[PDB]
Write a protein that binds this ligand. Sequence first.
Ligand SMILES: CC(=O)SCCNC(=O)CCNC(=O)[C@H](O)C(C)(C)COP(=O)(O)OP(=O)(O)OC[C@H]1O[C@@H](n2cnc3c(N)ncnc32)[C@H](O)[C@@H]1OP(=O)(O)O
Ligand SMILES: CC(=O)SCCNC(=O)CCNC(=O)[C@H](O)C(C)(C)COP(=O)(O)OP(=O)(O)OC[C@H]1O[C@@H](n2cnc3c(N)ncnc32)[C@H](O)[C@@H]1OP(=O)(O)O
Ligand SMILES: O=C([O-])C(=O)[O-]
Ligand SMILES: O=C([O-])C(=O)[O-]
Lengths: 415, 416
Amino acid sequence: STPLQGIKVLDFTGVQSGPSCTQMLAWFGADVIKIERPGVGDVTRHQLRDIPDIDALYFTMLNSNKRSIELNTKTAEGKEVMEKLIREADILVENFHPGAIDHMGFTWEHIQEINPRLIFGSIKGFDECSPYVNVKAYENVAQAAGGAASTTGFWDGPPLVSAAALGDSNTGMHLLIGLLAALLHREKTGRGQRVTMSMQDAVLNLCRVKLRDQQRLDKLGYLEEYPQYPNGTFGDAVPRGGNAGGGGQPGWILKCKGWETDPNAYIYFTIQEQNWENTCKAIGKPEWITDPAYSTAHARQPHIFDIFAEIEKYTVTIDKHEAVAYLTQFDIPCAPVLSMKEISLDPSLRQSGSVVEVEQPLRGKYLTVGCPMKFSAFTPDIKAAPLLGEHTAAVLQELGYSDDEIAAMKQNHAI
Amino acid sequence: MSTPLQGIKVLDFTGVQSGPSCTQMLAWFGADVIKIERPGVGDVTRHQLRDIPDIDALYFTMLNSNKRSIELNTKTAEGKEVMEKLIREADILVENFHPGAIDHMGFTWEHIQEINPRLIFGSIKGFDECSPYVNVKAYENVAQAAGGAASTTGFWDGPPLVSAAALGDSNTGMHLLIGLLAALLHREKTGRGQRVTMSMQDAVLNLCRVKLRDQQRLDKLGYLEEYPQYPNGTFGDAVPRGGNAGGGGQPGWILKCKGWETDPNAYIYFTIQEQNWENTCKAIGKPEWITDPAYSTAHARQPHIFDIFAEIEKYTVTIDKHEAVAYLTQFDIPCAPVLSMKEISLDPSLRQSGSVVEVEQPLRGKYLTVGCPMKFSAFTPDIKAAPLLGEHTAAVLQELGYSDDEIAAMKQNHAI
Ligand SMILES: CC(=O)SCCNC(=O)CCNC(=O)[C@H](O)C(C)(C)COP(=O)(O)OP(=O)(O)OC[C@H]1O[C@@H](n2cnc3c(N)ncnc32)[C@H](O)[C@@H]1OP(=O)(O)O
Ligand SMILES: CC(=O)SCCNC(=O)CCNC(=O)[C@H](O)C(C)(C)COP(=O)(O)OP(=O)(O)OC[C@H]1O[C@@H](n2cnc3c(N)ncnc32)[C@H](O)[C@@H]1OP(=O)(O)O
Ligand SMILES: O=C([O-])C(=O)[O-]
Ligand SMILES: O=C([O-])C(=O)[O-]
């Protein structure tokens, strides 16, 4: 068995936020029916193609294990099919621009009459209450609005976006939590419900510790662990802190051998509070262990960049991998800045099922990020992403449509 | 009637941020969450970066709302027995201790199963069990380094950069939460618990799926057509940093608005949406660019896209970010202000949506927390104070069936 065996999902989503969510649902065992615009399909099929005329990697990495139907829900037949699908499904997911699904006639209120057991998941850029409620949102728009860009980067540089999908995949993961909770809830109420998740909120959730800092800053007028303390200045808003420890312990990104030509010849190095002695032994500074300018976090802070400068006299003489292999003997929390190339070839990520080679029709092999959490009682089986409308006939037949009904839909551009 | 996890009992061994974010959500969903804490010490976040002397820090109160706290030393004969009885009565056990730590207490996953075959065991670590870094301690930024985020965040002429967002911590907690919910759904069918593990490296990698897409494109082709480096810069063998480029979204950049020279947040993100070129040109008074073949497609714009962004900035710098956005959105341009944490903390709509929540804590009074991020039509989480250390020890022990003599003996023996 799988966790979602028997669950039926209607997947209206496109791009990244919505499809990351329903991809996971499929991996957990749900039957995920991707509803696509006839002749067009999810925009990621044509975005940044690396092989001419076939589905792009953006699409294949987000749509493994799904089924694809072409269905134009703005036709009379399409709306009826859509209604039959809602009637038989457990879950409906959409991440269209605000209004979009409503204007098809498929608003929450109509959905409940058709299927009171259905769980409706909706992703938007912004909440119902927001002044930005009808604003279209892409990844970095949510990063700006959710507090991440404000607090990421350097104090003497611009706001900076994160490479990580804080707005897209992160939001899809947050809706997934809601959908799972809603399934557990339905076990008790006998009812579906609506779950919404905004991109702004998904970003904000991950910046909880910066909202901690803002309150500290409001009360006190300073942040004792930030690079600006005590010889710089604070304004009224949490500032950017470069490569400071954030939610972790004090740390920095340090150069290792190769840095002048290799943009990834670096480590993250943590000065953990209780590990100062080991940290000093590691770098051959036994005289720093009990020196009152060095022995506590509070004393180190005013000259912490001298201390990082001193660790860097060692780290630049060896490869990041050598550097880490040594320092971890001293129980220092550290790790190489791994490039996407190193991650793509890393044997242990293959073994753990974190990076998965999948075979796609026409394309052949590609790599995807696998199911990130591991279960002792089940292993996801990660498969190819569907060709556009590959499963239209089968889905219509499962609903009870005759061959004549299907041929009429095709004639009428409903599929 | 009725919350999603009503009747669910959770044993929460977690400390810091990754495990506690997970169990906080479990509590908001209705679960009874028992935080097991070291006697006289508690979760380290109680003492980290206190803004008020002698009381629980905000790091703690923002991560431990709605939980119960017991002081219990599981290294004592009594503590191990209480722990066993707690595992027998619980649905879920969550831990994020250093590698080895919970094993060395005498309830190994294999031992947990014998005690309660219905129990779901959730475990967070920095790295997976076959990683060469399996025993490495991981904080937030260590996971960001190892998971590919730091490598691909920042500028091409600067260092790797960490993200402010908790990619390693709260993100990993959210990923374990997904596993725990799925495992509860799976138990409805099997009648059995299971172990769910989540590493911090994997949580970061999951959010960088689009950079793994780019690595493969780069391996096949030798270039990334949408990256700032194309076509007039150079590519190496690894996905490079691209500054404020659109990433998984459409081409875009962080642009200066009025005040930028003194306000580090006087900026917007501006997206050039492919199907919106005409409106974009109208917005900026460049009607002549609509069909100019140097401008009319994404492919044609790319070699001189920073000129285009520079031209947008001649408008955006004359006006403040909020006005810039109210104007541009009339043209269907995807944009938003770079909101500071100050703006977010005071934002009325975030209060109205339950996204920023004012909670009243004993001794401290009011604080703000990030609320339950997704919204449910059939239920509203009730977000409460975080527990004082050991506040619920007696209650939990009595629920297990211990007498007053048994509890007094535990206290004498430093088991609580
Ligand atoms: C917000 C964040 O999560 S930050 C990111 C790091 N967090 C993670 O989730 C990654 C996994 N965890 C870790 O790597 C580690 O817990 C770290 C690096 C965060 C911290 O490690 P440390 O502070 O050095 O030790 P840690 O808090 O894990 O445990 C210390 C000891 O307390 C013991 N302990 C914990 N709770 C109890 C208890 N109730 N009774 C008795 N002992 C206890 C542990 O078993 C361990 O003891 P041991 O070395 O004698 O076997
Ligand atoms: C790369 C990233 O950053 S991903 C960010 C994703 N964003 C979200 O998830 C939040 C909500 N999404 C959005 O705001 C938007 O979908 C955007 C901005 C991402 C993209 O929007 P657009 O490309 O302008 O249009 P979108 O794909 O939403 O829909 C366009 C039309 O297709 C229609 N449509 C969708 N599926 C179908 C179908 N099966 N049959 C007929 N029409 C359909 C929609 O109803 C809409 O029509 P309408 O404007 O006449 O009402
Ligand atoms: O959390 C921290 O960074 C600290 O304790 O200094
Ligand atoms: O997705 C993109 O960035 C694109 O299509 O250029």
